[PDB]
Design a protein around this nucleic acid. Structure first.
Lengths: 201, 49, 66, 104, 115, 103, 49
RNA sequence: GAUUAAUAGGGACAGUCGGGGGCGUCAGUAUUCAAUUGUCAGAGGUGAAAUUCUUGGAUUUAUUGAAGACUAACAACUGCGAAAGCAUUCGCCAAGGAUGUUUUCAUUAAUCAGGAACGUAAACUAUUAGGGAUCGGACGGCGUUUAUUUUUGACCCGUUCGGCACCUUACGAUAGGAGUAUGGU
């Protein structure tokens, strides 16, 4: 009911193409880590070029593409690659059941020092709270200045969005991870299938 | 000893910095059409009798 | 004179503050200018260059502009 | 324009990164930014209040306006690219089927 | 060939395959995922969008337009601004069961400053 | 007050570095690295986690770490680890990613 | 033991002192597919020929 | 009759600079509400549900109008203000900082009793002696680009003030708890 089958086999009249721009340090990393991305995108059937003059990634559908979702996967892939995620993580968003999201978190806090405190609180001591959030939601979270990048499945995306909202609204991430652990236990045992779970939080 | 090694690393950093300053001044100034004065020449400011 | 330029500046910021009446940074700067004016005027009273009864709160301002 | 069409033009311009530079940030001071926007408003108004709507869109297709903006603003600060990102016709006051079939 | 434009409104909760003419006003056919799957939990499934796209493509080829411009969107006001598994699997099922695809555009409403 | 939460927070590093996060690239590459698809991966992870719990309970030294090295291997290991952590902090400062504060 | 490390010596001296092949070069660089301003100049030269 | 003119002060002028403030004005979307049209069975949540809205047509699609809010991306190991705080365009109003001067008065200074103006939270924590960045002036000048050629601005680099921060150096410094018993209450 939830499983996505791999596309087995010209579905594009107008040769579609997407573009994104990036700065110079990203140009250095993208140039010495590009051939992985272009091998995987050629396997899916999408021609991808990088321009170190202008600083622009371009993806475009070739003649031999058949998977039509591949161009949108390519668009989100190159958006994240400009947004400085690691390249193996980008090739993992090239999977079928994967999806990204960005959370703008600068608007939700007014005071500068309070926002810095809450962002470091979301990241946690030694990265422990972050990696434990990644564990309990099966996602990958990257606190990126004013925005928070996240990749994973859709249920986990909703959970991570909720947790980021509550941590910015000053509900502590330790409280949130305790909530998530208890919810995980109630997901394990099946005799508690459909009741109001609020009696345990 | 530690003080001498520390201060000589700082001395190398300062001398390399001054050399890069003089190098950029040569490359971007009108002094480009001259020969680099040797340092054994640069040691004596003036001689008089 | 230094005191003349300072009281002219105080007159200017006071006229603007009377027209607007909402900001507070203008009030803070007017306070600082009034303090500087009072210290300098005190020094000038001590050196004796002006009459010791010369005072400015607002009527000296209105008379010097009128 | 000449045909009593009131319209709004929203133009967007990105700052040029000059070749042979080492400084990573190509920031312009706020005085330069306001002067560049003033020149942009001047150029757009001067090349949009002289012509008709058909001439305006015959200008909009090959992007002459961004080219002239770049050509006239590169002296105050070079611009990487100048596009006209929106063109909204607000009010049309006439129904001239003569001019309409003249287009068609 | 006649291009019809399909709005795929793919939330996290439900999926909307919507087919209109180039105006966007004249609705040809719409099929959601909730009207094809019984479970509200499974309402947003790639299976739901697969069945929805099969129904929609069957309808629009029985009309005979066989070519679609695709506009995908998501909940954009205070939501996530990213489409759904409905969107991906629906596009896949569509161009598998026919439907020469023209221009793809991800037209989501992005607020300048919301709250 | 809670304990199992403290265990999860502490041992997340080992668990996510071993095998349990199929969306993180390190965790998937380590789910097929060879030393976690070997025969007793969960047992070796159990050994590491039991040492971590005793270290939280109050032991000052470890059981997994080695003690005697010929100073060249140890200086090489320590220099490489410090260079890698500094390189990650620098490649975070560039691109603006924030990391955890630690002296 | 004692001969010149020729590559090291040429690099040291560099540090002190400071129409058939371009076709296969462009073929090699068209599989990257980095735009590469040197490849740009080379493509302009190949346009000129 | 009246000193140096201070590497302590204030003032003037000029070119500037700023997401400093106040007043009006201009837009941008989005949200909500409403209208019109195409609609045709769910839409909406949630881990799962439900409440609710739904043939008088919800959600959706397209076009408008009104209201109220905020100003995404740009957005920084930046900028501004005394703090709190400050990011749409433009106009006005005053103020303010830095720099330069072939500009003045010459202790006017520093500090704070008293006093005066501004106003749901927390939750892992006389130099250092240089260097590389950075922004604001100012001076310079091998050259690219505006430049149809002088302006002028952009890029490079050098000199000199000033300041927000980095690292290195210190020049130094200094500031009962848990178990286990016994007997009472």
């Amino acid at each position: 009911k939830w499983k996505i089958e791999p596309f087995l086999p010209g579905p594009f009249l107008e040769e579609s193409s997407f573009m994104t721009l990036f700065p110079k340090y990203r140009e250095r990393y993208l140039k010495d880590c590009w051939p992985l991305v272009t091998k995987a995108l050629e396997k899916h059937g999408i021609a991808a070029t990088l321009d170190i003059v202008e600083g622009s990634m371009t993806v475009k559908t070739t003649r031999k593409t058949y998977d039509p979702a591949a161009i949108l996967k390519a668009r989100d892939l190159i958006k994240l690659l400009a947004r400085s995620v690691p390249a193996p993580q980008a090739l993992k968003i090239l999977e079928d059941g994967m999806a990204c999201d960005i959370i703008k978190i600068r608007s939700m806090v007014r005071n500068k020092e309070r926002f810095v405190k809450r962002r470091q609180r979301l990241l946690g001591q030694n990265g422990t709270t972050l990696k434990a959030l990644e564990l309990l939601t099966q996602t990958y979270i990257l606190v990126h200045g004013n925005t928070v990048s996240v990749m994973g499945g859709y249920k986990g995306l909703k959970e991570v969005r909720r947790v980021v909202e509550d941590t910015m609204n000053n509900i502590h991430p330790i409280y949130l991870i305790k909530e998530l652990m208890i919810k995980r236990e109630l997901a394990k045992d099946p005799a508690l299938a459909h009741e109001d779970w609020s009696r345990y939080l | 000893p530690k003080v001498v090694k520390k201060a000589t690393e700082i001395k190398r950093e300062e001398l390399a910095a001054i050399k890069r300053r003089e190098e950029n001044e040569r490359k971007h100034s009108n002094k480009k059409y001259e020969k680099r004065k040797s340092e054994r020449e640069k040691a004596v400011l003036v001689k008089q009798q | 004179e230094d005191l003349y330029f300072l009281i002219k500046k105080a007159v200017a910021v006071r006229k603007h503050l009377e027209r607007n009446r909402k900001d507070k940074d203008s009030k803070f700067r007017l306070i600082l200018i009034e303090s500087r004016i009072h210290r300098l005027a005190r020094y000038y009273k001590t050196v004796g260059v002006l009459p010791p009864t010369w005072k400015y709160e607002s009527s000296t301002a209105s008379t010097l502009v009128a | 324009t000449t045909d009593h069409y009131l319209l709004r033009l929203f133009a967007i311009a990105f700052t040029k990164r000059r070749p042979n530079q080492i400084k990573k940030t190509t920031y312009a001071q706020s005085s330069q930014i306001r002067a560049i926007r003033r020149k942009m408003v001047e150029i757009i108004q001067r090349e949009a209040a002289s012509c008709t709507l058909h001439q305006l869109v015959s200008k909009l297709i090959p992007e002459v306006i961004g080219r002239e903006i770049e050509k006239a603003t590169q002296g105050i600060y070079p611009l990487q690219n100048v596009h006209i990102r929106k063109v909204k016709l607000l009010k049309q006051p006439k129904f001239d089927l003569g001019a309409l079939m003249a287009l068609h | 060939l006649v291009f019809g434009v399909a709005r795929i409104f793919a939330s996290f909760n439900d999926t909307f395959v919507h087919v209109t003419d180039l105006s966007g006003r004249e609705t040809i056919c719409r099929v959601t995922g909730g009207m094809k799957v019984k479970a509200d939990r499974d309402e947003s499934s790639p299976y739901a969008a697969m069945l929805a796209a099969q129904d929609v493509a069957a309808r629009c080829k029985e009309l005979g337009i066989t070519a679609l411009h695709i506009k995908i969107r998501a909940t954009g006001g205070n939501g996530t601004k990213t489409p759904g598994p409905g969107a991906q699997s629906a596009l896949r099922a569509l161009a598998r069961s026919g439907m020469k695809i023209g221009r793809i555009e991800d037209v989501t409403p992005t607020p300048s400053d919301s709250t | 007050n809670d304990l199992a939460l403290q265990r999860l927070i502490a041992e997340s590093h080992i668990l996510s570095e071993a095998g349990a996060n199929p969306s993180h690239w390190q965790s998937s590459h380590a789910a097929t690295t060879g030393t976690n698809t070997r025969a007793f991966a969960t047992g070796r992870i159990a050994k590491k986690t039991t040492d971590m719990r005793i270290q939280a309970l109050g032991a000052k030294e470890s059981i997994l770490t080695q003690q005697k090295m010929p100073m060249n291997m140890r200086k090489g290991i320590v220099k490489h680890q410090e260079e890698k952590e500094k390189k990650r902090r620098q490649e975070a400062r560039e691109n603006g990613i924030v990391l955890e504060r630690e002296v | 033991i004692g001969n010149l490390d020729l590559r090291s010596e040429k690099q040291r001296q560099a540090e002190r002192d400071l129409n058939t092949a371009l076709k296969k070069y462009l073929r090699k660089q068209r599989k990257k597919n980095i735009i590469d301003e040197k490849r740009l100049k080379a493509e302009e030269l190949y346009r000129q020929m």
